[PDB]
Symmetry: D3
Subunit: 322 residues, 6 copies
């Protein structure tokens, strides 16, 4: 089954372990972006994927396109426009010192794009699932409205809608995010959202124990919720457990202890891609949460945004756990 996604690619520029911005003489490059990571990760698990996106017509934009080709993501729907690819700087963290990020994504070709450049019948042909996150819709009114527009056209073709809340304080205030999420949520089939999202965006009280049930109660259209519970002990030591709620039941993976941590970035996108894989493969929910959590766990040992492992490697690891 084929999947389409919508999202911005960024170049991440990272310091080496133990080196602060103020002492760095070189930066490691990684191409990534929430939705693009999900496309790459899905393609790793055998799903043909495609992404509607925008890059500048320069060598840096071309690196982003090359990243897609390398991981076999269809680039037919990459549009060339604007003046720059967005970037961010990441200062490595270890032990007591948390990673630190400086964004430089504003004014990017994507963020500034205001032109309807996609033939929807074409973008959506043969597609089973459409995936997008709250990062994209936060970038601008044009993007919020474009995404809704595309969601609706997809729903009319019976395409399933996957939505990753992915709230980023750095991108918008809780109230604006909330207004926007309330326009998307009634249109979603599969939703990545956790307890914090429940309280901030679903009017759920911090008090309620079964928040997934109350989230479904508010938006009965949502068949399935998925997220990880992360316990941050330090920048080098997390506990990680997958949750997947559907049909009135929460299914949980085993809890993994991850230490040390090579690179947590994209850990969430690995999880998301792995859940969608299980759904598309029509697995039982226990099988899906177990596989997806193993995938996200393994991603933490790999520098860069995307998860390099094939399905067999992930499955084998999930089976050793039990």
């Amino acid at each position: 089954k084929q999947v389409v996604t919508i999202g911005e690619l960024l170049m991440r520029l990272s310091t080496q372990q133990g080196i602060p911005f103020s002492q760095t003489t070189a930066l490691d490059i990684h191409i990534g972006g929430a939705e693009a990571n999900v496309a790459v990760n899905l393609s790793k698990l055998g799903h043909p994927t495609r992404i509607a996106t925008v890059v500048p017509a320069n060598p840096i934009g071309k690196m982003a396109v090359e990243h897609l080709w390398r991981h076999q993501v269809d680039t037919a729907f990459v549009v060339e426009a604007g003046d720059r690819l967005g970037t961010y700087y990441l200062e490595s963290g270890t032990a007591l010192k948390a990673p630190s990020v400086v964004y430089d994504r504003q004014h990017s070709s994507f963020a500034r794009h205001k032109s309807m450049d996609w033939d929807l019948s074409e973008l959506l042909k043969g597609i089973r699932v459409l995936h997008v996150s709250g990062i994209t819709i936060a970038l601008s009114t044009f993007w919020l409205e474009m995404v809704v527009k595309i969601i609706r056209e997809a729903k009319r073709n019976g395409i399933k809608i996957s939505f990753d809340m992915n709230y980023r304080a750095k991108l918008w205030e809780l109230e604006a995010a909330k207004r926007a999420y309330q326009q998307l949520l009634p249109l979603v089939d599969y939703c990545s959202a956790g307890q914090m999202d429940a309280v901030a965006f679903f009017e759920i009280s911090s008090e309620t124990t079964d928040y997934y049930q109350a989230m479904h109660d508010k938006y009965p259209n949502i068949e399935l919720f998925y997220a990880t519970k992360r316990t941050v002990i330090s920048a080098s030591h997390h506990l990680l457990q997958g949750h997947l709620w559907t049909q009135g039941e929460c299914w949980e993976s085993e809890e993994y202890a991850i230490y040390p941590i090579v690179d947590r970035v994209g850990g969430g996108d690995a999880y998301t891609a792995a859940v969608l894989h299980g759904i598309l493969s029509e697995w039982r929910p226990d099988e899906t949460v177990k596989f997806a959590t193993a995938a996200a766990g393994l991603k933490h040992s790999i520098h860069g945004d995307i998860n390099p492992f094939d399905e067999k490697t992930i499955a084998d690891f999930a089976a050793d756990k039990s």
Copy 2:
């Protein structure tokens, strides 16, 4: 003798020798900017310098400021504002393949700045020379008009004005630049301008042999012109010779053959700083052009934007070859 400059600092991100953008997995970092480079270079030669500039209040902007501290450039007139430090990417060149650049300087804190945040009584106190380049005035109407205002105030106080043409095609059209240069040129004392500048912006004829003389006729206020003549044989082999015109005569250094080339970036800025150093030390024109060309030559052997050598090292090389 103190020198003040005005300009934007950029972070350069470079590939390693022989590696194209498409295969690079890491980029080397260097902080620089034409006027900032001149400031640093002058500091290395014993001149207290300061710079009026703008950076974001984030760790990346802090990197630019720390670069100034490291090289003993006064930072009291650095202004924090905006959301980003401008950058550019540089793909290494060697042999037949020229270096290649991709700018990402737009929307920088400096470029977007529209606020008069400099106390001029303070900025210009104790100052002997003010230096600025054509890159700064190409960025916006505000910077063009801001530099003009500081210039006029500067002259009022008997401060000498050093102006580096530094036309960049990727910043503006010849016509726009021409109009702007026409506002600055009448205010300049020491001008870094070459043969293509004379044709381009001085309305000088292409045929004319004594361009410096004719440029001076056009703007009699300009006491001295300085440039290098670069012969580009390959990305790894240049010939370099310094020119310095004043009082009706061109003075020229010996011609250096530079090969291979480690990093030509900031080579012009090393020249510019070394010329200014000579003027400030009241050297003769022959001593100055000689010293400055040696400085520029040595810079080509050093990765990054600034010239690491002290006067003695530069002078010993110049007197050597």
Copy 3:
């Protein structure tokens, strides 16, 4: 215009400049191979390409496959078989000291392969040119035989044949190579071959000034020959000039001086790809040889096997010299 090729992919393991094997602590990796480099270089110039080849079903085989995806070479006709990817070690050379190689390509999946795993009608569907080199047919009788079949099949379909003599002493002795070449030569349209080839394989006396006219006389079928004239001054200083002969006239490029030299490997494949490009573009001879020599010259400035430049970048450089 599509091109298909046949050839082995190797992993090159290279020392850094000034570091001999005996002092090296790390080796840089590059994937490459004469035909694959031509494929990749043609793709860089806008020609859809595909390649018939063999790699093991392991992570190292996979790296060769990923190399192809990265550069948009079709991999549908990559076959997975055998036990190892061929490799070779390269010790960098500078100034008086020449580069030095230790091959480790024996027993590669490609070299060992004895199975007819290609559907010829699929492989040649929509193909305007078939390219292959002396390396491939030297590897075994199976490969010589396979190349012959495929050419005869291509020839019947109106497909042009491109052939790189690419004689390698390490792979076979003159006598064997010559008998092999004598089967292919009457079937070639475009031929990369130089004076040593003429003397070695075209039966031409070394006393003949115009060897190209004589080689053409031996084989009136070959519509053009191409090659570079390399003057080795040192490991860091070469002169390079392109030749292209067709219809009774040798056309020459300017002679470039190349110093220093970053990486000469694949310079010949850059030249080949560029010449084929000019042919498929139906350019004039003087334009082609000018373009292709610039391409090959620029390639010397880039680590690894393939030429990273686009057409406009090469053509801009070619037009600067004169």
Copy 4:
């Protein structure tokens, strides 16, 4: 408020993780020195600092000076003389293998210096605290007596005295050290001393649980002691807890678990500088000890000798652990 310090700068030359001296092909460089590190760290926190020190008038000595500039420590009192900058080699440690050091600091300019080249009225002008360590006074009888002469001039002018025991087996015998310490301690206001110090140098029975109270009885002039309690589990796993004793009370921070460890070097200097910052800002004991332990903890995540964090970053971290 302004601080003066006295001490030698060293160039540290470090192997990479997991690489022993016998296999290293490059060494990473860091400039440091107990007192110099304290100066840099104070300056990070807003305190103008200056340092009386000696370096050779050569490019290596210059690196030491440029390190001071970069971190805005006043260099007006750096004296150029002698033949060499002291160095030491540090072999990385991880897990069971402890870091290993080899000093190459004898015969340095600082070590051999015998000249009184500092105008004291200028050196002590506008100063509130003078800081020095047992490292400096161990280097020579000249430095021992020079530090004594300065502290005495300082004390006349109403300046507080900060002393860091910092006993080094490598530098001297306990008894000689003991005798030197007996000259300094009666003269100190703020002492960095642990229980090891208490037993070895303050003649406090190792039975004694409240060693600070006994140390105070011995030296009633000492207003407050400070130190970290370090529990070494391995070279990659330490527990760290700050202690600060003043007017009859010991005040503790939370105990931090640090793992892995990036670079413990200079962690004590980060603690020392943080404590002094708190003393200078007139914070309460519990504030200072909490802030300083956090500063020291974070330093462990950074390669090199100095702490790169600003006050807000440190304060925010400290506030999160509560």
Copy 5:
């Protein structure tokens, strides 16, 4: 006391921490091999060592030889032949991700060797201990029979036989290996072998508790058994404890917690060499097991196959 060994050297090509094969642009080089590592590690502890082995006459073969010179192993019995040095690729593991290997050792000079190029009275001259492992004998029948001949001759001379089982499933079948081990075990004095070995090759039921006693009973010729008990929590966290059995008593070290892990490769070879060192120095069994476990644990902190520490350093750590 001098030690001789027999074994193949391989070049290991490794990715850096956190980098998969698919993204690596360079590979770090390490020379090693089970028996070659034991030889180097013994030399580190003051024992003159030598190794019977085969490398190609090319620059890569030469790297293997210079590795031996660097570490003062005698190379008089290195033979040059064949076409290639065997290699393998190692993809780093950290935390949940286990390291992974791709072997490229087949058709190696050592593997394809069929020529008896060693003067045995010279190779064994002045030697106190002969060491070899299950890796060598698995490579070819030629090597199996070569090793047997050499053990036979070594025994006539009063030379002690050290054997490391080192079963590698990739090299041969359980049944094929069982039959080789049966010809060797009756000839062994010091044996590196664990509970899995006891069940797989000594025909002991997985039931028996005191497996070493049962192993001794099967082969009363074996004076000492040694092995580590390793508990893998993750790729970055192992527990490690040494065992040494002799005269009907097992002797155990303290259990070490190792984390993170820099490079576990050659950890067992470090253990083997240190045990042999203790035996040759005539230490008590408790000193030996404690010393060798310390040695093995420290090796985990060092990139590469060999243990760079001297006796004093290892001994100081064991005592602290």
Copy 6:
């Protein structure tokens, strides 16, 4: 034929190309020293060599020793003593910018040595040639006198004396040097010296054209002189030609243009070892000067102090 040398090993710490001291964050390590380089280079050409030297008993001293083991130089005559290994820093040079050096060799274990810790009969056993340079004798009166003492014992045993003037202004003034050279020269068989040496230390006038003949006249015991003529165009472009004088003739190699230059350090030592190799192999002078000049030329392409090429590789290059 075996060779003994006497000299100090230094650790060289270098910046990478285009990086000045002021911006470097790491330094590359190379072990070397004029005489130690000669010993290593001779070993590469098949001669068993040994070196009398001193290093500290610490891990840095050990790196110097491991360097010798790796290149098969005998270390039985390395003595451990004192507090530090000498070092120097080298700032890379390219094109117009010459490399720049800062020495940190004073107070080294070797520099400060004052104890006769060598059994001369053992040091010289089996030796055909003894080599030393003006660097060693300049370090202290102890080393000057110790070098003479060893030379004399060597001559009593028919050993040939190879001396490399190698005057270094950093180490001593011309007068003191000349004094010392005047004790050594009457004892030398093979001498590395050029025209500047002739004027400076042989008291030849800068008028004489045939300076070697005049130098021989003064010291007829000197069978042959050898040196390179270097023309420095830039830090990345040198011309190099070898000279070799014997039996009243100067033999010159072809002239090599070297560009770019990877690392000139040890270039002279490569020349010296290759010349000695030719002498020991009893080659004709034209064969020797051609081979040695090629050796020295190839060295310029290799990072570090020592020449990695074998004889066949150098000979093949010379023949082109």
